[PDB]
Write an enzyme that holds these catalytic residues in place. Structure first.
Site, short mmCIF file in Angstrom:
data_model
loop_
_atom_site.label_atom_id
_atom_site.label_comp_id
_atom_site.label_asym_id
_atom_site.label_seq_id
_atom_site.Cartn_x
_atom_site.Cartn_y
_atom_site.Cartn_z
N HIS A 77 -6.98 -3.87 -27.89
CA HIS A 77 -8.33 -3.89 -28.42
C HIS A 77 -9.01 -5.16 -27.91
O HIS A 77 -8.41 -5.99 -27.26
CB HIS A 77 -8.44 -3.72 -29.96
CG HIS A 77 -7.88 -4.83 -30.79
ND1 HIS A 77 -6.54 -4.95 -31.06
CD2 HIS A 77 -8.50 -5.81 -31.49
CE1 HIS A 77 -6.35 -5.97 -31.88
NE2 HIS A 77 -7.52 -6.53 -32.15
N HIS A 79 -10.28 -8.00 -29.23
CA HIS A 79 -10.25 -9.29 -29.93
C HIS A 79 -9.53 -10.33 -29.03
O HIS A 79 -8.72 -9.97 -28.19
CB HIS A 79 -9.53 -9.19 -31.29
CG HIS A 79 -10.37 -8.64 -32.40
ND1 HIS A 79 -9.82 -8.14 -33.57
CD2 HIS A 79 -11.72 -8.57 -32.56
CE1 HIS A 79 -10.80 -7.82 -34.40
NE2 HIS A 79 -11.96 -8.05 -33.81
N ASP A 81 -7.04 -12.47 -29.34
CA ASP A 81 -5.58 -12.48 -29.24
C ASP A 81 -5.05 -11.49 -28.23
O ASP A 81 -3.99 -11.69 -27.64
CB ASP A 81 -4.90 -12.29 -30.60
CG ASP A 81 -5.22 -10.97 -31.29
OD1 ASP A 81 -6.36 -10.50 -31.18
OD2 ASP A 81 -4.32 -10.46 -32.03
N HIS A 140 -8.13 -1.17 -37.77
CA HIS A 140 -8.33 -2.60 -37.67
C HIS A 140 -9.61 -2.94 -36.89
O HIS A 140 -10.36 -3.84 -37.26
CB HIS A 140 -7.09 -3.24 -37.04
CG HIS A 140 -7.31 -4.62 -36.52
ND1 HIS A 140 -7.35 -5.73 -37.33
CD2 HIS A 140 -7.50 -5.08 -35.26
CE1 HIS A 140 -7.57 -6.80 -36.59
NE2 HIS A 140 -7.67 -6.44 -35.32
N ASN A 171 -8.39 -9.72 -41.57
CA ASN A 171 -9.71 -9.68 -40.99
C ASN A 171 -10.28 -8.26 -40.98
O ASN A 171 -9.82 -7.42 -40.20
CB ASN A 171 -9.62 -10.22 -39.57
CG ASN A 171 -10.92 -10.14 -38.83
OD1 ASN A 171 -11.99 -9.90 -39.41
ND2 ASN A 171 -10.85 -10.34 -37.52
C1 LIG Z 1 -7.85 -13.27 -34.96
C2 LIG Z 1 -7.01 -12.03 -35.19
C3 LIG Z 1 -7.50 -10.92 -34.31
S1 LIG Z 1 -6.56 -9.39 -34.56
C4 LIG Z 1 -7.06 -11.57 -36.62
O1 LIG Z 1 -8.02 -10.99 -37.02
N1 LIG Z 1 -5.93 -11.80 -37.48
C5 LIG Z 1 -4.72 -12.49 -37.09
C6 LIG Z 1 -3.88 -12.62 -38.33
C7 LIG Z 1 -4.64 -12.00 -39.44
C8 LIG Z 1 -5.86 -11.35 -38.84
C9 LIG Z 1 -5.70 -9.89 -38.85
O2 LIG Z 1 -5.12 -9.29 -37.88
O3 LIG Z 1 -6.14 -9.26 -39.81
ZN LIG Z 2 -7.88 -7.69 -33.77
ZN LIG Z 3 -4.49 -9.39 -33.63
#
Ligand SMILES: C[C@H](CS)C(=O)N1CCC[C@@H]1C(=O)O
Ligand SMILES: [Zn+2]
Ligand SMILES: [Zn+2]
Length: 218
Positions: A77, A79, A81, A140, A171
Site C-alpha cells: 500500500h 504508506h 513504511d 487498513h 491508525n
Molecule cells: C505509520 C504506519 C503506517 S501502516 C501506521 O499507521 N502504524 C504503524 C503501527 C501502528 C499503525 C497502524 O498500522 O495502525
Molecule cells: Zn499503512
Molecule cells: Zn504499516
C-alpha cells in the site's frame, strides 16, 4: 530461527524457511515488517521501508548475504513504511510492483510511482518462487493488498492484519472500518489452509491474527 541484524539493530532479518525471511526495520521506535524471497533469479522483497536510507541499507545487507541482486519489490500500500524507499528502487533499476490504485495514491502523495501492474489477483514467478498478490477490498487503507506464497502457504498480511500485540486498530485515518472485516473474510475464504501470517507490524503468527483483527473491528 536464524536472526541477523545490521550493526545498529535498526534492520533485522529472520528466517522462516530456506528461501523466505522477514525483514524488520525501526522508524523513529516503530518496527515494520516485509519479506525477503531468495530465488534462483535474484532477491524479491515484499515492501521497502520507512525511507530511502533504511531501504538502501536493507538492500545492501541482503545482496551481500545472499550473493545476488534485488530485482523486484512488491509494494502493498501507499504508506511510508511500505513505499518510503521507492526513489531508491527506481534509481537502482529495481522493479516496483503495485496495483494501479496504489500507484495513483503514491503519486497523489508526492512519491515516485510504482508500476501499477498488479490486478485483483496476479500470479508472478521469480525463478522457482511462486507469488500471488490479492486485493481483498478496503481495510487498513483503500488499496491494501496481501501476498501469498503457495509453495509454503505463507500469507503476508501487511498492515491489513494486526499482530497479537496490537490491542486496538491503530491508525484509522485512511481506513475503512465498516469494510475491513469483509476484506479479512475475503482473505480467509481464499486461503483456507495457512501456515504462517506476517503482519505489517509485530510478531509473525498464524490464521489467529486474522481472527484477532476481526475482533478488534467489533
Ligand atoms: C505509520 C504506519 C503506517 S501502516 C501506521 O499507521 N502504524 C504503524 C503501527 C501502528 C499503525 C497502524 O498500522 O495502525
Ligand atoms: Zn499503512
Ligand atoms: Zn504499516
Amino acid at each position: 530461527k536464524t536472526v541477523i541484524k545490521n550493526e545498529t539493530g535498526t534492520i533485522s532479518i529472520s528466517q522462516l524457511n530456506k528461501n523466505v525471511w522477514v525483514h524488520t526495520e525501526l522508524g523513529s521506535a516503530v518496527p515494520s515488517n516485509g519479506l525477503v524471497l531468495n530465488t534462483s533469479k535474484g532477491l524479491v522483497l515484499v515492501d521497502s521501508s520507512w525511507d530511502d536510507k533504511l531501504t538502501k541499507e536493507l538492500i545492501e545487507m541482503v545482496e551481500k548475504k545472499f550473493q545476488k541482486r534485488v530485482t523486484d519489490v512488491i509494494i502493498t500500500h501507499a504508506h511510508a513504511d511500505r513505499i518510503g524507499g521507492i526513489k531508491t528502487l527506481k534509481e537502482r533499476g529495481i522493479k516496483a510492483h503495485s496495483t494501479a490504485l496504489t500507484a495513483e495514491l503514491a503519486k497523489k502523495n508526492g512519491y515516485e510511482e510504482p508500476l501499477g501492474d498488479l490486478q485483483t489477483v496476479t500470479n508472478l514467478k521469480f525463478g522457482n518462487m511462486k507469488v500471488e498478490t490479492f486485493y481483498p477490498g478496503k481495510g487498513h487503507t483503500e488499496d491494501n493488498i496481501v501476498v501469498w506464497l503457495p509453495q509454503y502457504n505463507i500469507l503476508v498480511g501487511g498492515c491489513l492484519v494486526k499482530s497479537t500485540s496490537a490491542k486496538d486498530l491503530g491508525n484509522v485515518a485512511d481506513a475503512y472500518v465498516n469494510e475491513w472485516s469483509t476484506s479479512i473474510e475475503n482473505v480467509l475464504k481464499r486461503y483456507r489452509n495457512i501456515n504462517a501470517v506476517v503482519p505489517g507490524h509485530g510478531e509473525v503468527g498464524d490464521k489467529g491474527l486474522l481472527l484477532h483483527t476481526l475482533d478488534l473491528l467489533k
